[PDB]
Amino acid sequence: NDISLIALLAFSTLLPFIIASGTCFVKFSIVFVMVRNALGLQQIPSNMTLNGVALLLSMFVMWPIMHDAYVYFEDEDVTFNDISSLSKHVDEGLDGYRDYLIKYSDRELVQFFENAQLKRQYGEETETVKRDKDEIEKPSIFALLPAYALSEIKSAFKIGFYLYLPFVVVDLVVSSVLLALGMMMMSPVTISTPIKLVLFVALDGWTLLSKGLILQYMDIA
Amino acid sequence: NDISLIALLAFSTLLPFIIASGTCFVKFSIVFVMVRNALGLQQIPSNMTLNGVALLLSMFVMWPIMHDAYVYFEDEDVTFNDISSLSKHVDEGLDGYRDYLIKYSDRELVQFFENAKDEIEKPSIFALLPAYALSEIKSAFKIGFYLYLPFVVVDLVVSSVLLALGMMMMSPVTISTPIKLVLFVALDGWTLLSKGLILQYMDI
Amino acid sequence: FYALYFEIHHLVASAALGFARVAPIFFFLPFLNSGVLSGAPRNAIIILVALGVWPHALNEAPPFLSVAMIPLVLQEAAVGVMLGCLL
Amino acid sequence: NLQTQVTEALDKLAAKPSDPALLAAYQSKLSEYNLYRNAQSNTVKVFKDIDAAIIQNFR
Amino acid sequence: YLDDVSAKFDTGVDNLQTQVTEALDKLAAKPSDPALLAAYQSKLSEYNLYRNAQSNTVKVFKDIDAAIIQNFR
Amino acid sequence: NLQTQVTEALDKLAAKPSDPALLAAYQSKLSEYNLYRNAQSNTVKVFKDIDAAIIQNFR
Amino acid sequence: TPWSGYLDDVSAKFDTGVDNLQTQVTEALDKLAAKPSDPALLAAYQSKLSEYNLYRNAQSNTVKVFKDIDAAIIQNFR
Amino acid sequence: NLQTQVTEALDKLAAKPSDPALLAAYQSKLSEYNLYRNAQSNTVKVFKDIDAAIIQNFR
Amino acid sequence: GQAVNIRSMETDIVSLDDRLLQAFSGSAIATAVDKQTITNRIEDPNLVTDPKELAISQEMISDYNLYVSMVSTLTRKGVGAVETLLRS
Amino acid sequence: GQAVNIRSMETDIVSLDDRLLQAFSGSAIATAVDKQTITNRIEDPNLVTDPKELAISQEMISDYNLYVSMVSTLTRKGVGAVETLLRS
Amino acid sequence: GQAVNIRSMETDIVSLDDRLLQAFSGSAIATAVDKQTITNRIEDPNLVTDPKELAISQEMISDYNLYVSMVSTLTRKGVGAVETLLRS
Amino acid sequence: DPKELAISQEMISDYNLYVSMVSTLTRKGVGAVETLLRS
Amino acid sequence: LKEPVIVSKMAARKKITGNFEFHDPNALLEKLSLQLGLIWYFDGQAIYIYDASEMRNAVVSLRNVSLNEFNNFLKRSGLYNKNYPLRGDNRKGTFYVSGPPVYVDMVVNAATMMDKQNGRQKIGVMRLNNTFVGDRTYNLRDQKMVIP
Amino acid sequence: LKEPVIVSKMAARKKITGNFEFHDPNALLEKLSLQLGLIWYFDGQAIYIYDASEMRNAVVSLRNVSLNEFNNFLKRSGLYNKNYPLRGDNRKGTFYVSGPPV
Amino acid sequence: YVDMVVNAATMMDKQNGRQKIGVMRLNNTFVGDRTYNLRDQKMVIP
C-alpha cells in the first residue's frame, strides 16, 4: 500500500519524456518548425512560444485518454488478494492508452520489432511471427513506442512536404523573372519574401491546418 | 489560504509562457525583427535589446487587467460555505482576461474548440488561448507584409540603374543598404509605428 | 533483492554504446536532422531506438567492463558515419 | 480565558498553604495548563514547517 | 542478521523463560516460605536484566544500519 | 576484521548476562564499534560525493 | 594482536588506579558469609561494597561523556 | 595544552574514586574539556562550509 | 454523527478548466474546513485532556501532513514537466 | 495605553513607477518595525519570562518568517520570468 | 518452516516490463499484508502485554522500517540515473 | 549486515558513476563530430 | 474433452498442420505431449498446458505433519497425479515436488497453510504392600528423627 | 435468457457470423462455450462471460470453521455451481477453488 | 443501488441480554453454614 505511493512518484518524474515520445505532440512540433523554415524566417516566430501552442492542442486531444487514468486509479478497491489479478488490474488500466497506439501506428514496423527482440531474446531458432498475429495477440508496450514515434515522423513529413510545394513554385518563378532581366547579381530571396507571406494569410493556412489535424484523431458531434 | 499559496506559485512558474503566448507581446516581438530583415540586417541591434522593449510595451496594456486581480482577490468575502460560489467567484475575476481575449479572437474557431451566445456564458479559457495567438500571428504576418513593401522598391530601382549602365557584375547590397536606412530615419518610422501599436488596442 | 536494481542498471549501461552507433544517422538524414527536429524530444527518440535493436540481452552483464572506453566511442562513431553516408 | 482560572486558585493556597482539598485541586489545574500551552506550541509548529516546505519545494 | 543478535540471547541461556514461571508457580502456592522467597528474588531480578539487554543492543544496532542506509544517497 | 572481536564477546554475556566485569568490557567494545561503522560509511561518502560533482561540472 | 583503544585506555585506567577491588570484595564475601554476624566483618564489606558501587559507575559514566563527543565529530563529517 | 592537564587529573580519581574534593574539581575539568572539543569541531565546520559555498557558486 | 454521499457527480464536459476548477475548489474547501476542524479540536480544552481523544488528534495532524505535501510534490512535477518542453 | 491609526491615505499614481514606490516603502517600514518589535519583546526581559506572552512572540516570529519568504520567491520567480523572455 | 524453489532459471521475457511489473506486484502484496499483521499485532491487546511477544513485534517494526527504505532509495537512485541519460 | 551493507554501499555507487561517465562521453563524442561536420 | 483448455503463451508459437480425429482424447493428450514435447495437468475443472521447458522444482519442510498424512488429503480431494508423484521418505517432513507451474505452487501453498493451523497425561494407582506410606517422625526423645 | 449478459473486452475481439435459431438457449451456451473456448457463470441476476485463458485459482485456510458448514451455506444461498466445485477434505480448513474471476 | 445498501448496513452496527432473578425455596436442608462445637476440633459445615 505504501510502496504503491512510491510507484506514483516514480511515475511522476518520467512524465514529460513520455510526452516527448508517447503522445502525438511529436506530430505538431515538427510541422510548425517546417512552416518556419519554409517561409525562410530563421529566428522568428520565436519557437519558444511555438512550443506552447503545439502543446495545448495535443493535451486537448489527449485529455479524454488521460482522464480515464484518474477514474481507473482512484477506485477504492485497488488492493486485491492475489498477485496475478493485481498485475492483471494494471494491464487493463493501461489498455486505453495501448489501443490508441495500435490504431495510429504502422502494422509491419511494430511487427518487425517483436521478431527483432525475440532473436535477441532466445536466438535465431525461434520462428518468426507473420502479419496474422494481429487478430488475437497484443505486443508489449516497449516494442510499440519505438515504432510509433518513427511512424509519426513519416506522417508529419507527409504534411511538411505538401505545404512546402506552394511556396517553392513561387521561389522559381521569381528567380526566373529576375533572370528575364539582366539582374543576375541580385538576391532573389528578398523579393520572394513579400509574396511568400501573402500566400499563407490569403489562403489563411493557420485557421485551416489547425482544424485539419484534430479531425485526424477525433470527430465532432 | 494555504492552498491559495500553491496557486500563487502556480501562476508564477507558468508566467513566462502565458505572456509568451497569451498577450500582444507576440505581435511586438515579431514586427521588431522583420524590420531588421527588411533593411538587410542580421545582428543589428540584437535579439536581446529588442526583446526588452517589446516586454515593456506589453506591460502597459496588460497591467490594468493584472491590477484588478489583486484588489478583487484581497477582499474579505473569501470565507464561503459553498463550493460553487467560490468557483463562481474565481471565475468572476478572470473575465477581464476573457473580454481581452474574446475581443481579438475569432468566434468561429473557438466554437470549433468548444465542440471538442457569448452574453449568457463565456467560453472556456482553454477554448480560445490558441485562437488568440493564431489570430495575432496571422495579423502580425499581415502587417509584416505591408512595411516590407517600400524597401522592395529601393532594392529594385538601384538594381535597374546599375543595369542602366553597363555594370551588371556589381553587388548592389553595398549601395542599397546606405539608401535603405535613410528611408527609415527621414520618415522617422521607428517612433511612429510604436505609437499606433499602442493605439491598436488601447485608445488614446 | 539486489539483482532487480542491476537489471535496470545494466540497461542504462547498454544504451550508451547504443547511442554512439546510431546518433550520427540522426544528423545526416533529411527528415531527421536538427533543422526538422526540436531539442526536447530529440534525445528521447534516439535512446529508445537503440534499445529495440541491441543484440545482447538487457538483463545480462555487458562485456564493456574496463576494456578500453575512450577509444571505443571513436570506433562506434566512425562506423556510425559509415551507416549514415551509405543510407 | 483559561489563565484566569489558573490565576485564581493560587491565592487561596497562598493565604492558606496547608488545606488538603485546594492543592489537590491546584495540581489538577496546573498540570492541565502545562498540557495546554505546549499543545498550542506544538500546533503552531506544524503550521510553520509545512508552510516552509512549500517555498522549499518551489524554490 | 538482526535475528541472530536476538537469538544469541535466546540460545545463551537454556530455559530461563520457563525457570521464572515454575518459580512463581511455587511462589503462588505457598507465599510464606523463606527458602521460597529468597530463591525468587535471585530469580526474578535476573529476568529484567536479560530483556533490556536484549532490546537495547538491537536498538543501538537499529540506528547504525539506519545510518548506513542514509549514506547511500 | 574488527567485527570478529566484537562478535566474540556477545556469547559470554549470553551465558551470563549478570557478570559486572563482562558488560563493562562489552560497553567499551560496543560503543567503540559504534564509532567505527558510521565513520567508515560517512568517509566513503565524501569520496562518492565529490567525484559526481566533477562530471556534473563537465557535462 | 589483542588491540586497545583510547576508550580501552580510560577503562583500564580505572583498573590500574584501583588495585584489588575486583577481588577484595570476594575475600570479604568469603569471610562475612562464613559467620554472618561479626561487626568487624559486616562493616568490613560495607566499606568494600560501597566503594565497589562508586568505582563501577565512574568507569561507566566516563564512557558516555567520552562517546557522544566522538559522535559529535562524525556528525561534523558531512 | 589543555588536554595535558586533562590527562593528568583522571589518574588520581582512578586511584581514588571516593575523594570528595577531587571529583568535584574533576567534573569542573572534564565537562569543560567537553565544551571545548565540539566548539572546535563546530567552528572549523562553518569555515569549511562557507569555503565550500564559493566553489558552489562559481561551478 | 456521520454522513456520507455516495454517487459522485459526473458527466461529459468538453470544457476543461471548470473540471479543474471543481478540483481546485473541492480541494480548497476540504483543506479549509479541516484547518478549522483541527484548530477547534485543539482549542476546545475538553478534548485535549481526554486520552481517548488524543489518539484521534495524532491521526488528523498526520492526515493533514501527508495530504498537502503530496499535492505539493505532484504539482511541482507538474509545473516542472511543462518547463522541460518550452525552455528547449 | 496603546494606539492605532485608522486612515489609510491614497495618493494618485502618475505611472507604474509611482505605484512600485508605495509597495516597497509600505513594506520596508513594516519589515523594520516587526523585527524591532521582536527585539524589544526580547530586550524587555519581563516579557520573555511569562508563559502567555511567549505564544504571542511565537506567533510574531513565524509570521515574520512567512512574510519575507513569500516576497522573496515571488520576486525571484518574477525576475526569473524576465530572464527567460529576454533569452527567448 | 519455509519453502524454497531450487531452480532460479532465467525465464526469458519478451520485454523487461513484465519482470518489473511482477516485481512490483510481488512486493506490493507483501508489504500490504505486513502492515496489517504488525498493526493487528499492536491492535490485539493480548499480543502486547506479553514481554516475550513484545520484542518480536519490536523486531518487525525495525524490519518494516528497513525494508521499504531499502526499496525506496534504490528506485530513487534509479530514476535519478535514467533521467541524466535521457535529458541530454 | 554491517559488513555486507558497507561493502554493498560502494558496490552500488561505483557502477552508478560509471554509467553516468559512459553517457557523458557519448555526448562529447558525438558532439565533437557534430561541430566538425558543420566545420 | 468436456473441460475448457488453457494453453500457455510460449507454447502457442509452435505450429502443427494435418488431419486429426478425436475419439479418446485423454490418450491423445498423453501421446502428443511426448512427441511434440509439452506438459499438461487436469485439476477437475480445466486443462492447463505448458511446454516442457517450464517445469519447476521445489523442496519444503513440514514441522509437524507427515507425507503420508498429506497424501491422503491429495487423494481424497482429487488433485493427486500419478505421473508426478511425491518423492520422499514415508514418515518425515521433507520431500521434493516438480511439475507444471500451476500444479507446484498449489501443493506448496497448502503445505505451509497446514503447519500454521496446527502430550497426554495418565494416572496409575499403586497400592503398597511392604511399607507404610507418608513421612514418619520418631520422637525418641534424644533427637527428633524423621524418616521420609 | 432472462438476465443481462456482461461479456468482457478480452473476449470481445473474436468475431462471429451465421444463421442462429434460439430454441434452447442454456444448451446453446454449453456448446458454444466449448467450441470457441470460453468460461461462463450465472449467479441468478446476470450471466458473466470470460475467455478460457482467464481462469484463476487460490487456496485459503479457515482457522475455526469446517468446509461442510460453509458448503451448507452455499446450498442455501444460491451460489453453488456443480461445474466448478470446491476441492478439499470434508473436515479441514484448507481447500482448492478454481474458476471464473467473478 | 449497491453503494447505498452497503453503507446503510455498516452504519447500523455502529448504532448497536437481560439478567433475571429467581427465588427458589429449599425443602430438605437448612441454608447457610453451620458450626458444631464438639470440643475436639472446631468443625464447620458449608
Tab-separated table of N, CA and C in Angstrom, chain G residues 6 10 13-14 17-18 54-55 62 65-66 69 72-73 76 78, chain H residues 7 10-11 13-15 17-18 26 30 34 37-38 41-42 45:
chain	number	residue	atom	x	y	z
G	6	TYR	N	41.495	4.117	22.827
G	6	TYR	CA	41.516	5.210	23.795
G	6	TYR	C	40.397	5.065	24.811
G	10	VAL	N	41.005	4.449	29.030
G	10	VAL	CA	40.435	5.080	30.211
G	10	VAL	C	39.739	4.053	31.088
G	13	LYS	N	42.424	2.431	32.735
G	13	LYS	CA	42.968	3.426	33.654
G	13	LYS	C	42.278	3.343	35.003
G	14	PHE	N	40.975	3.063	34.992
G	14	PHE	CA	40.267	2.753	36.224
G	14	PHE	C	40.737	1.441	36.831
G	17	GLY	N	44.190	2.219	38.524
G	17	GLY	CA	44.112	3.105	39.671
G	17	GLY	C	43.642	2.367	40.907
G	18	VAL	N	42.577	1.583	40.761
G	18	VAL	CA	42.250	0.605	41.778
G	18	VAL	C	43.232	-0.554	41.656
G	54	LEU	N	30.776	3.035	43.682
G	54	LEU	CA	31.252	4.287	43.093
G	54	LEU	C	32.192	4.031	41.930
G	55	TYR	N	33.030	3.007	42.049
G	55	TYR	CA	34.028	2.757	41.028
G	55	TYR	C	33.409	2.209	39.755
G	62	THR	N	31.936	7.766	32.624
G	62	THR	CA	33.032	8.323	31.844
G	62	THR	C	32.918	7.924	30.381
G	65	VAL	N	30.143	10.220	28.492
G	65	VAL	CA	30.650	11.534	28.103
G	65	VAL	C	31.750	11.429	27.056
G	66	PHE	N	32.544	10.364	27.086
G	66	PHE	CA	33.556	10.178	26.056
G	66	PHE	C	33.065	9.499	24.784
G	69	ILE	N	30.911	12.820	22.308
G	69	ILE	CA	31.792	13.813	21.713
G	69	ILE	C	32.387	13.279	20.422
G	72	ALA	N	29.940	13.620	17.998
G	72	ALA	CA	29.759	14.985	17.526
G	72	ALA	C	30.772	15.324	16.443
G	73	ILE	N	31.932	14.665	16.458
G	73	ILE	CA	32.912	14.868	15.398
G	73	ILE	C	32.396	14.267	14.099
G	76	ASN	N	29.962	16.067	12.448
G	76	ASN	CA	30.549	17.144	11.672
G	76	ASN	C	31.375	16.628	10.504
G	78	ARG	N	29.966	15.488	7.574
G	78	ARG	CA	29.318	15.998	6.375
G	78	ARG	C	28.505	17.248	6.693
H	7	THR	N	44.634	14.969	31.056
H	7	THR	CA	45.105	13.595	31.139
H	7	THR	C	45.931	13.318	32.387
H	10	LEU	N	42.765	12.508	35.841
H	10	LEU	CA	41.907	11.329	35.913
H	10	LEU	C	42.537	10.208	36.730
H	11	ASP	N	43.868	10.160	36.821
H	11	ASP	CA	44.516	9.018	37.457
H	11	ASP	C	44.400	9.077	38.973
H	13	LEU	N	41.802	10.337	40.405
H	13	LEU	CA	40.452	9.821	40.564
H	13	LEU	C	40.394	8.343	40.238
H	14	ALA	N	41.287	7.859	39.375
H	14	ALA	CA	41.340	6.421	39.153
H	14	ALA	C	41.870	5.716	40.392
H	15	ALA	N	42.900	6.294	41.017
H	15	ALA	CA	43.435	5.722	42.243
H	15	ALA	C	42.508	5.966	43.419
H	17	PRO	N	38.607	6.989	43.516
H	17	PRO	CA	37.284	7.445	43.091
H	17	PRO	C	36.336	7.558	44.271
H	18	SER	N	36.800	8.117	45.389
H	18	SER	CA	35.937	8.439	46.511
H	18	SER	C	36.344	9.720	47.220
H	26	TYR	N	37.323	17.521	39.288
H	26	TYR	CA	37.423	16.736	38.067
H	26	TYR	C	36.236	16.964	37.140
H	30	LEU	N	36.370	18.122	33.504
H	30	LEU	CA	36.076	17.224	32.397
H	30	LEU	C	34.918	17.714	31.542
H	34	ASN	N	34.880	18.945	27.494
H	34	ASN	CA	33.803	18.555	26.588
H	34	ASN	C	33.243	19.735	25.803
H	37	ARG	N	35.889	20.835	22.902
H	37	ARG	CA	36.234	19.999	21.762
H	37	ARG	C	35.197	20.120	20.654
H	38	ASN	N	33.910	20.112	21.009
H	38	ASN	CA	32.874	20.247	19.994
H	38	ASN	C	32.766	21.669	19.488
H	41	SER	N	35.147	21.676	16.841
H	41	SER	CA	34.609	20.946	15.706
H	41	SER	C	33.587	21.786	14.965
H	42	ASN	N	32.769	22.527	15.704
H	42	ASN	CA	31.752	23.347	15.074
H	42	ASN	C	32.324	24.600	14.442
H	45	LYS	N	33.937	23.797	11.145
H	45	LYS	CA	32.933	23.292	10.220
H	45	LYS	C	32.318	24.416	9.407
